[PDB]
Amino acid sequence: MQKSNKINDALNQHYKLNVELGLVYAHYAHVADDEFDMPYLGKFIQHLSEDKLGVHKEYISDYFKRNGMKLKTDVSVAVKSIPSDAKALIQEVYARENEVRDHVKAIAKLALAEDDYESFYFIQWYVRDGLKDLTEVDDVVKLFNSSNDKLIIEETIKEMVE
Amino acid sequence: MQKSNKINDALNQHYKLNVELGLVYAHYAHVADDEFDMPYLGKFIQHLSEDKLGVHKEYISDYFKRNGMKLKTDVSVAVKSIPSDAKALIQEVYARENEVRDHVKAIAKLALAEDDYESFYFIQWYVRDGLKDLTEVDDVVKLFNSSNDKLIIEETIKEMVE
Amino acid sequence: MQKSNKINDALNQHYKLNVELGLVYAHYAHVADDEFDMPYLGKFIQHLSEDKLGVHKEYISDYFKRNGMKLKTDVSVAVKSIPSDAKALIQEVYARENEVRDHVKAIAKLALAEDDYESFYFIQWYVRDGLKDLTEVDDVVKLFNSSNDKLIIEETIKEMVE
Amino acid sequence: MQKSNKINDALNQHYKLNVELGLVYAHYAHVADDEFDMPYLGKFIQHLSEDKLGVHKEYISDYFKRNGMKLKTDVSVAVKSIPSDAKALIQEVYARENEVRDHVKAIAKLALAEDDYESFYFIQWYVRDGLKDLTEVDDVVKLFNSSNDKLIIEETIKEMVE
Amino acid sequence: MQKSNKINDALNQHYKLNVELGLVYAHYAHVADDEFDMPYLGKFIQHLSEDKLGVHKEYISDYFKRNGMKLKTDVSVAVKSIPSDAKALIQEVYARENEVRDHVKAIAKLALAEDDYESFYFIQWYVRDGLKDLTEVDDVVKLFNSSNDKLIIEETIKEMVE
Amino acid sequence: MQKSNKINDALNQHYKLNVELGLVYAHYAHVADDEFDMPYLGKFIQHLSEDKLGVHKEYISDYFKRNGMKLKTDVSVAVKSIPSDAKALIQEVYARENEVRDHVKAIAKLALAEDDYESFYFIQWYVRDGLKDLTEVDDVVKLFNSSNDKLIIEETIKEMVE
Amino acid sequence: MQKSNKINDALNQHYKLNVELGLVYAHYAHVADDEFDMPYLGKFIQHLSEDKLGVHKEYISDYFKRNGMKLKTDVSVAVKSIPSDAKALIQEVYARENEVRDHVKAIAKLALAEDDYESFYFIQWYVRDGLKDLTEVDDVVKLFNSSNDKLIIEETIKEMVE
Numbered sequence A, B, C, D, E, F, G: 001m002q003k004s005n006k007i008n009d010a011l012n013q014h015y016k017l018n019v020e021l022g023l024v025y026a027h028y029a030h031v032a033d034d035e036f037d038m039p040y041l042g043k044f045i046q047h048l049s050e051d052k053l054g055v056h057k058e059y060i061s062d063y064f065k066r067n068g069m070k071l072k073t074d075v076s077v078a079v080k081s082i083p084s085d086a087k088a089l090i091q092e093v094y095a096r097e098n099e100v101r102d103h104v105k106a107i108a109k110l111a112l113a114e115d116d117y118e119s120f121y122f123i124q125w126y127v128r129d130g131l132k133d134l135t136e137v138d139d140v141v142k143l144f145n146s147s148n149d150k151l152i153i154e155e156t157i158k159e160m161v162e
């Protein structure tokens, strides 16, 4: 029956987070290619950008249509400083994906507290994807600690963003 | 040789405009489906959203990589009121696409003033797409003035967003 | 280990509800076609009837075989008045599907209370299908509020029950 | 021309009989598998259940649409005791199918008495299927009198419900 | 964020249980074939052995890599007495699979207590497989109570471990 | 004719050695991936684990069925310290495979001493595989002495564990 | 109508520039392979040589045939010193491609000044190719600043001049 307002707000914020994250990553992808001369790192980060700005926000929008929750569009993001090198750039992406896992955990917890079993279900996809996206990112961070050669690292990323 | 700062700013603003427009349309697509019961109108507007948030912003980002212009990410958009009915919604989309045509005209004009023939070229795509997107939108507005039946109109949009 | 009697009763009632619902819809499908001259509405409602009388009851019966819960067959249903028009008919179907969502929510809640994680799992399918069936039904109700032409509406349903 | 009320009532009862029979068999199929460890016997009886709850009731509903007879849905069935073993279970199914043959004979006889040659025709399908379903059932009963080995019997049923 | 130590220990024990179970079943498969002259029973039990020693332990190992839980390898198992006949052998396997269902239930319960929604998800696979493996095993136990002929039973198992 | 007890014991120990080795390697594969960031090294070592826990133990179990030797399952293995780096890890694996070659040599020697020409034959497979597995391992050890770049080494292992 | 002499001279010089550039690059390709042991760098530079000596000069020659401009062949080029290493070699190629962009910009500017809209069109291809060729070259220069290993760099160029 009736929609939970708490869940509605929590999913609107997550909508907001995926929009703004995806806009940050689109900038980070540009810089990976341009300043840092790592176009495959940039193609890995652009695919993560399109992920956040696509299905991560689409599923919420579609879910709201089915249960009567209200969509809210309030976006504010400015990319004001860039990490100093490619390593720090991908470590930054990592840190935001770890925060994704913490936010979706709060939403699952709330859904059980509300007895919103439809929302707990809806969020199970995000529960899993939080770890998948974090793992894929972690697989790139590891590269910068396994070789000091930008072109070696780039050649390895190629086989990941194929 | 040297990048024109005026063109750099003008293309950063157009980047900003396409991001924010595409975020507005993604909301407008939701409402077309949800409140107004017109899922094909919503699929037409979601495709326009993905257009603005995809190649419209990607081409600028890629162009900047080739000539040395600096990418700027500063986004601010809140969807605070929605048009009252489907007709007004698509008329609103129309009005923004007409403003797109005026903004790209300013950029072409500036590129000639700067003797930036690479930028005049780059913008020729946007020159044409301004009219194409406006025409496609206009083809939907016309529908609301040609029949008073939501389901008739919807069935016609289907053959456009195929 | 040991089967929860509470869950056994709750799933027997849901078995009962799907049988009786599916028998009501089979009658409602007939009337949609016969009295109301809407054979596609009738084919939409007959497919929902076969859904409830098929996998909705089969999954419970099969689940009981695996865990030792006892099947109970006690059916009582009489279709004693019919809604006055096609709109009211599909609105009636809607109202019962909304009650399905409330009943499956009670079963998920109980399964957690009982620490019956096998039953919480089994019910996740019903958790999702409650919203899917309700959405599909809602997509038909919307039609009667979007056009006053029976044949227009019928032509739209055709593309849903394909 | 005008519909015979006697035939209308006789076909409504047969509708009722097929619904309730099919609900009994769905329970009997469960028990064949669960208690009696004979899943192929259970698959034979589930197919007979779906037969009664499908085309046996659908043909009447569809026939009524063509001639103006009124559909009646009044169902009452409770499965309150189960036969003691698989043999007795299939003998029970047999006895109900023999009663099907007697009921359809009454309807053919009445249709001639009423000079309802459309209804005599419609019922010819049921005239034949009464003997076919009874024969298929009889082919399973014979198995329990031809071998004392549950797994031998099961392996034979497999080639019937293929 | 931070890994739950309780969950880490509970999943290490389950790792241990699947290793040792799979080593017991590999022995039980040998005996089913050798002493008891039932090679298909032995092929059913060898497939269950490879299941426990494969994906049942691999998924935990892979999950630990993604979240930072520590893998522990401490194995101790000796097969010191064998059941007296094939029936008792498969009943023994049954009893261990029923204990699997109880252990995974404890892990799901703990994951909710810890608000480890990633671990509750990870375990949902084990929640379902506990019942699937138990059912498949139960389907073999039933055979020894449905016929007194070893070769009849063997021929039936063949169609299960195909 | 009669089974040699000495050979029976020697093959039971080799059974034990392959089980426990394969359990150690499954842990070593995890660590290669997790701690050392070398997933292809980990995939090489996991394939060696599955080799030891599969056909290396299966062939003995199957051989015992044919000649009447008794299978013994007594397993004890705990992984209590891990080598400090990837190089030392693969050197450790090497050292155990060299001990495999010494153990199978003892079994061939004993089989001739016993005039067990069936067992000498059975062991010829292990005679050859001792050198093959050792060579494949040696091909990985050589990598750590041929380049100081983890990602270079990883890319080479990829073409071996294809 | 009448051909612009200014445009005729400007396009004859560009003809001259592409001939002489392409002859320089053919020498630079030889040296990349021979002295510097980088055959893929040499294959990248030979393809750029054939580009300048092919379509870059052919399009002008063909354009002159259509509008009545006079072809002039006056070539003077001697390769008298070579850059000291592969890096400096590709940086040299870069610097000449940047001068190409400046020369074609002068021709576009002149064509507008002359109201030679056919020549402005003809040159739009060169406007774009100036940036494309420069970008491809820049993608090779970046390699020498991303790794100190000639064979690593060579392996990367391979995937560009495929």
Ligand SMILES: [Fe+3]
Residues within 6 Å of the ligand: A005
């Ligand atoms: Fe609120």
Ligand SMILES: [Fe+3]
Residues within 6 Å of the ligand: A047, A051
């Ligand atoms: Fe992806």
Ligand SMILES: [Fe+3]
Residues within 6 Å of the ligand: A064, A065, A068, A069, A070, A071, B030, B034, B035
């Ligand atoms: Fe909405």
Ligand SMILES: [Fe+3]
Residues within 6 Å of the ligand: A036, A084, A085, A086, A087
């Ligand atoms: Fe960098």
Ligand SMILES: [Fe+3]
Residues within 6 Å of the ligand: A112, A113, A115
């Ligand atoms: Fe609660």
Ligand SMILES: [Fe+3]
Residues within 6 Å of the ligand: A051, A052, A056, A129, A133
């Ligand atoms: Fe994702």
Ligand SMILES: [Fe+3]
Residues within 6 Å of the ligand: A155, F155, G155
């Ligand atoms: Fe390489």
Ligand SMILES: [Fe+3]
Residues within 6 Å of the ligand: B005
């Ligand atoms: Fe400026």
Ligand SMILES: [Fe+3]
Residues within 6 Å of the ligand: B047, B051
């Ligand atoms: Fe388009």
Ligand SMILES: [Fe+3]
Residues within 6 Å of the ligand: A030, A034, A035, B064, B065, B068, B069, B070, B071
């Ligand atoms: Fe840039």
Ligand SMILES: [Fe+3]
Residues within 6 Å of the ligand: B036, B084, B085, B086, B087
């Ligand atoms: Fe509207």
Ligand SMILES: [Fe+3]
Residues within 6 Å of the ligand: B112, B113, B115
């Ligand atoms: Fe000018």
Ligand SMILES: [Fe+3]
Residues within 6 Å of the ligand: B051, B052, B056, B129, B133
């Ligand atoms: Fe567009």
Ligand SMILES: [Fe+3]
Residues within 6 Å of the ligand: B155, C155
């Ligand atoms: Fe139409």
Ligand SMILES: [Fe+3]
Residues within 6 Å of the ligand: C005
């Ligand atoms: Fe009770």
Ligand SMILES: [Fe+3]
Residues within 6 Å of the ligand: C047, C051
């Ligand atoms: Fe369906």
